[PDB]
Design a protein around this ligand. Sequence first.
Ligand SMILES: *[C@@H]1O[C@H](CO[C@@H]2O[C@@H](C)[C@@H](O)[C@@H](O)[C@@H]2O)[C@@H](O[C@@H]2O[C@H](CO)[C@@H](O[C@@H]3O[C@H](CO[C@H]4O[C@H](CO)[C@@H](O)[C@H](O)[C@@H]4O[C@@H]4O[C@H](CO)[C@@H](O[C@@H]5O[C@H](CO)[C@H](O)[C@H](O)[C@H]5O)[C@H](O)[C@H]4NC(C)=O)[C@@H](O)[C@H](O[C@H]4O[C@H](CO)[C@@H](O)[C@H](O)[C@@H]4O[C@@H]4O[C@H](CO)[C@@H](O)[C@H](O)[C@H]4NC(C)=O)[C@@H]3O)[C@H](O)[C@H]2NC(C)=O)[C@H](O)[C@H]1NC(C)=O
Ligand SMILES: *[C@@H]1O[C@H](CO[C@@H]2O[C@@H](C)[C@@H](O)[C@@H](O)[C@@H]2O)[C@@H](O[C@@H]2O[C@H](CO)[C@@H](O[C@@H]3O[C@H](CO[C@H]4O[C@H](CO)[C@@H](O)[C@H](O)[C@@H]4O[C@@H]4O[C@H](CO)[C@@H](O[C@@H]5O[C@H](CO)[C@H](O)[C@H](O)[C@H]5O)[C@H](O)[C@H]4NC(C)=O)[C@@H](O)[C@H](O[C@H]4O[C@H](CO)[C@@H](O)[C@H](O)[C@@H]4O[C@@H]4O[C@H](CO)[C@@H](O)[C@H](O)[C@H]4NC(C)=O)[C@@H]3O)[C@H](O)[C@H]2NC(C)=O)[C@H](O)[C@H]1NC(C)=O
Lengths: 210, 208
Amino acid sequence: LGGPSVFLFPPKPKDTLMISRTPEVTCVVVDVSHEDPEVKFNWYVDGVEVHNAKTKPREEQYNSTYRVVSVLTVLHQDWLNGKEYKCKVSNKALPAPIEKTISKAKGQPREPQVYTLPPSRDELTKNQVSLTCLVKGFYPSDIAVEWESNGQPENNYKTTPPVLDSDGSFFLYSKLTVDKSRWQQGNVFSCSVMHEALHNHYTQKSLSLS
Amino acid sequence: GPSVFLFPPKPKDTLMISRTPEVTCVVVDVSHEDPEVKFNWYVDGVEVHNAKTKPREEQYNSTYRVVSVLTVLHQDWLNGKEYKCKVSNKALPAPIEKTISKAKGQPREPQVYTLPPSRDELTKNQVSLTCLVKGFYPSDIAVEWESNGQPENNYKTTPPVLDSDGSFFLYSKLTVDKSRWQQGNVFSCSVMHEALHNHYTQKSLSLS
Ligand SMILES: *[C@@H]1O[C@H](CO[C@@H]2O[C@@H](C)[C@@H](O)[C@@H](O)[C@@H]2O)[C@@H](O[C@@H]2O[C@H](CO)[C@@H](O[C@@H]3O[C@H](CO[C@H]4O[C@H](CO)[C@@H](O)[C@H](O)[C@@H]4O[C@@H]4O[C@H](CO)[C@@H](O[C@@H]5O[C@H](CO)[C@H](O)[C@H](O)[C@H]5O)[C@H](O)[C@H]4NC(C)=O)[C@@H](O)[C@H](O[C@H]4O[C@H](CO)[C@@H](O)[C@H](O)[C@@H]4O[C@@H]4O[C@H](CO)[C@@H](O)[C@H](O)[C@H]4NC(C)=O)[C@@H]3O)[C@H](O)[C@H]2NC(C)=O)[C@H](O)[C@H]1NC(C)=O
Ligand SMILES: *[C@@H]1O[C@H](CO[C@@H]2O[C@@H](C)[C@@H](O)[C@@H](O)[C@@H]2O)[C@@H](O[C@@H]2O[C@H](CO)[C@@H](O[C@@H]3O[C@H](CO[C@H]4O[C@H](CO)[C@@H](O)[C@H](O)[C@@H]4O[C@@H]4O[C@H](CO)[C@@H](O[C@@H]5O[C@H](CO)[C@H](O)[C@H](O)[C@H]5O)[C@H](O)[C@H]4NC(C)=O)[C@@H](O)[C@H](O[C@H]4O[C@H](CO)[C@@H](O)[C@H](O)[C@@H]4O[C@@H]4O[C@H](CO)[C@@H](O)[C@H](O)[C@H]4NC(C)=O)[C@@H]3O)[C@H](O)[C@H]2NC(C)=O)[C@H](O)[C@H]1NC(C)=O
């Protein structure tokens, strides 16, 4: 016992922002029983049925239920224009098909402002210091943030989740931890942001000892 | 059917004697057919019965959200005692146990750093005052802002984030009219955490 359940996952924020990448919506059905293992997917874009999804064969799990995945490739401009993607899942153990819908959050997009903040005077008594990137005033909350210096990725960073601000836009901070020496030697560090409301879906802000 | 969820105290409440920390047992999706709920509470095994149940708010789906509330001792929670909630029903095949306690591990003191607005931002009507709090453990923490002894309220604080060393960090953003910052007012980020001496510290921020 335990009827099937459906989870619908959006594309990754970077994937809709760059045409070289492949944005996808993923419809996952879990807890499919052995007695009723047949699963049917119907896909709709703004209520209109589409037939180009790629559905995988069911995969039995170690708890003896089946998991079935259907992947719908989306056009970047369709996602950014706010189309609604509906996954309809039909199983003979279900009273009625299960429907899940996903889209970009509704609202007018807002351009992020990106500000770099150097380490506090207090922190420069430690061996590692904190380079901060503040990204505020953006909408919707889908965004990507990265760090680099001299063209190469800096991996020792963490980014807060987006946070709803009091004007209804979002903000976040990204913290990059570097060895104090590197900051003191005047290296330039770069915070880069990918968001739909930026020109070319991209901006960069630099930060160095001055 | 009914679902049962247990919630911990607010961090501020466990850190100040004058505040009242509580654990909270909430029950969703309870029907009129079967809307009668019971509660038992236990603390580190040793049962207690100084709890208190509340009014079963009916919700917009013919279900009755029910809630019990157990008051807890500050140092019991900070010493890691477990708090178990058992809700006996009759539409229940069996009773449902649910337990909660403070995150395990050596507490670590937050470092607090204030950062002033970026130069680029100073062309706006309002500016962002930043408070970085890092290196703390557990993630239970409270952050406030004030100026001239009075609370600043137009601020937002990120959730704690797991850092690479296993400690947590967060950021708090206070937004002020740029004129206030230009005048030279002093703004204060205050941080409450169990690993702080007297559970409290302040860092101040002014135009300099
Ligand atoms: C039997 O086993 C199965 C299988 O489990 C496996 O086998 C067993 C035996 C064990 O070994 C087990 O450890 C194994 O994992 C069990 O199946 C599980 O069933 C549960 C439900 O019971 C599912 O729980 C939901 O998980 C969601 C998150 O799933 C992702 O994250 C977890 C890790 O955190 C992964 O394990 C998952 O696979 C998912 O991973 C995501 O997968 C996507 C699809 O591939 C990825 O997206 C794609 O990725 C590519 C790559 O880049 C491209 O980018 C594509 O473009 C992109 O589409 C995605 O990146 C990937 N992420 C990660 C991190 O890996 C939760 O979302 C979900 O929560 C919702 O539902 C809850 C109610 O059930 C609710 O409480 C939650 O709040 C939430 O509700 C939603 O909330 C959000 C906001 O918070 C709202 O937006 C929604 O509206 C709201 N919906 C509501 C309210 O309805 C669940 O927690 C679990 O995922 C599933 N596992 C697997 C592997 O599928 C099964 O339970 C067992 N049965 C029994 C009886 O025991
Ligand atoms: C019928 O309606 C009801 C009511 O909803 C309302 O009515 C409908 C009609 C709509 O109008 C709707 O919009 C309305 O909201 C529906 O009710 C919901 O039912 C779901 C269950 O299906 C419940 O979802 C769980 O939520 C838990 C968190 O709840 C808090 O947060 C939400 C917001 O996110 C609030 O809505 C809640 O009220 C809770 O808010 C917290 O409340 C506490 C109690 O008061 C507060 O603490 C106290 O506060 C006081 C004063 O404020 C003192 O300070 C005390 O000191 C303090 O203790 C607290 O502050 C407050 N916080 C916030 C932020 O508001 C989730 O915990 C839970 O998730 C777990 O379980 C999931 C299973 O679904 C699982 O998927 C999750 O991943 C997660 O699993 C856990 O994971 C962690 C690790 O991450 C592990 O530790 C656990 O082991 C693991 N547990 C597992 C796996 O089991 C659920 O998501 C929801 O509570 C409830 N809504 C309400 C409002 O109560 C109902 O669904 C409808 N029915 C139908 C059939 O449609």
